[PDB]
Design a protein around this ligand. Structure first.
Ligand code: ZGO
Ligand code: ZGO
Lengths: 302, 302
């Protein structure tokens, strides 16, 4: 038993991380087969960052303007192109440590592990969720762009995120691996702000089930509600509406605990209206929304 | 910016994880050079677990009673011995992926990453602290024994923990890699309980500095206190006494923020006496004590 913010093991991804330098700008790249993927703003200088024309900036470079290192081994750039907001650097050597992989775009509410990197070297791993406003609450310093987010399905690494930049509120924004931003952001230093965030209701319910499984039952009650009555109070507290697909997804957790989904919604409803009043759930004094139903099953069953 | 519960990248350790079976009991082992280390209770059956004599149980086995697999490759056991509460299985092949490593015993308050494993296969990575009562609040299911805790210093993996068992309160107990238990626990199914836990004061102070660094300043004040006056109120709330060595260790964080350690103790003192009163710090509504001063420097500076 127990419950932790658990990341996927990062070994398969650590072998794909490289350093990319162009000019006086160094960041991280992802080396799969014979292509290195990195954020396109590596080709920027400081005078370009307010309003760059990446088309012009790219045509003024040649393959030898890009320094790519895998540890101490240097990689020879033999071609480059831009795909949306990423650069694709064709290199002369295929990464022998290339895992089976795919490129997926995730939806708000889903979670993934982030391998934070500096100068091509993995520094730490942590778990986060894609927020309803398409930002992530990450931990990133200067030079972290090109760090990637991933899930592991069986033996296949699904890459879903590449880090680009930090917003003024301290949250983070990035692209999928095809270079398309999550959210309404662009990689130029203009004033941009995220939309208002909301709480991911289905994730809070999953976490309450994890609590029950681990012996925390004080918030339960005998009542029940309906999807419409619950959704009515949820809007008041900036919680995401709950759909029947969500109820279905919570099925295995309902079964394992013998507590119906709509029973659990009744407990949540009362928690929102009266607070925790000095009690904790799974060691937290706030309702946690960054565990999916699948995260909970994976940790509380295997 | 941002602040996350960040684990070390696990690649170096994933390559050392193997499956060990003896009888109908399968758990994990750690394969370094030509030795596999695993919890000694792998040689137990269910009738032995209440009061095992591991000396007798071990003499009744031969090398062929131990099945050791590294993925699909089988490892040939050519010798075995017991070191305190671990088994050392000599095998015919040296692990080619053996990192530079050392075996260290950690002190209450220090943190480490845990690579949770089942059937020799890495499942997840998370960060935890060794509690003042020598337990850890982990996340472990059946079959997780032999999972290891580690830190990474430069290129060297320091192994500090091997998991053995779960206490009735849902917390976890294990050994260093020489087989010596942390805490007053023994690997037999007798009633044992942990001592009372306390809050790791130096870690709470480090985390308040992380908050200041990330823009959370509402709990600060102009007051100051002394080590003796602070330590007097800390005892009342089950906080660990603060020593001058702790003050020294917090030096770099004092310098970076321009807030003296004893200034920050004055803020903590007032937080303990009046609570947070509906406010959060770094996204938490409780005082967090599982980040060391070094964790904070590593994440908020590099
Ligand atoms: C360094 C800043 C945080 C100030 C910057 N952010 C903005 O310019 N934000 C915004 C404008 S604004 O703030 O309204 C104002 C105009 C400045 C008031 C623009 C982007 C959307 C949101 C608002 C930024 O991150 N930039 C600017 C250049 C790169 C990218 C960068 O350096 N990436 C890092 C690497 N490698 C990773 C970073 C570093 C810290 N932690 C991380 O995640 C870039 C090309 C975006
Ligand atoms: C399965 C139990 C949790 C009930 C068990 N715990 C105790 O027997 N606790 C204690 C007695 S007691 O509870 O007071 C009572 C007498 C039962 C009332 C004894 C140990 C100190 C504290 C109290 C246990 O863990 N055992 C028993 C056999 C192994 C070890 C084991 O199976 N290890 C797992 C593997 N692989 C990893 C586990 C599984 C879940 N998550 C994990 O971490 C073992 C040889 C210790």
């Amino acid at each position: 038993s127990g419950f932790r913010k658990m990341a996927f093991p990062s070994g398969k991804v650590e072998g794909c991380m490289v350093q990319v330098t162009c000019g006086t700008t160094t960041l991280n790249g992802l080396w799969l087969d014979d292509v290195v993927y990195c954020p396109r703003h590596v080709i920027c200088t400081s005078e370009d960052m307010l309003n760059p024309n990446y088309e012009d900036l790219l045509i003024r470079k040649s393959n030898h303007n890009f320094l790519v290192q895998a540890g101490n081994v240097q990689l020879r750039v033999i071609g480059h192109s831009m795909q949306n907001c990423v650069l694709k650097l064709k290199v002369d050597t295929a990464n022998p440590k290339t895992p089976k992989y795919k490129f997926v775009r995730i939806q708000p509410g889903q979670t993934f592990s982030v391998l934070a990197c500096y100068n091509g070297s993995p520094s730490g791993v942590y778990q986060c969720a894609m927020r309803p406003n398409f930002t992530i609450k990450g931990s990133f310093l200067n030079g972290s762009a090109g760090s990637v987010g991933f899930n592991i399905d069986y033996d296949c690494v699904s890459f879903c995120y590449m880090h680009h930049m930090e917003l003024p509120t301290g949250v983070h924004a990035g692209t999928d691996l095809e270079g398309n931003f999550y959210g309404p952001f662009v990689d130029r230093q203009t004033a941009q702000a995220a939309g208002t965030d909301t709480t991911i209701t289905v994730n809070v319910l999953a976490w309450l089930y994890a609590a029950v499984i681990n012996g925390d039952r004080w918030f339960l009650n005998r009542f029940t509600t309906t999807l419409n009555d619950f959704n009515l109070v949820a809007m008041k507290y900036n919680y995401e509406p709950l759909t029947q697909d969500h109820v279905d997804i919570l099925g295995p957790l309902s079964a394992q605990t013998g507590i119906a989904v709509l029973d659990m919604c009744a407990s949540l409803k009362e928690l929102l209206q009266n607070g925790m009043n000095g009690r904790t759930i799974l060691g937290s004094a706030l309702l946690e929304d960054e565990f999916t139903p699948f995260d909970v099953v994976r940790q509380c069953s295997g």
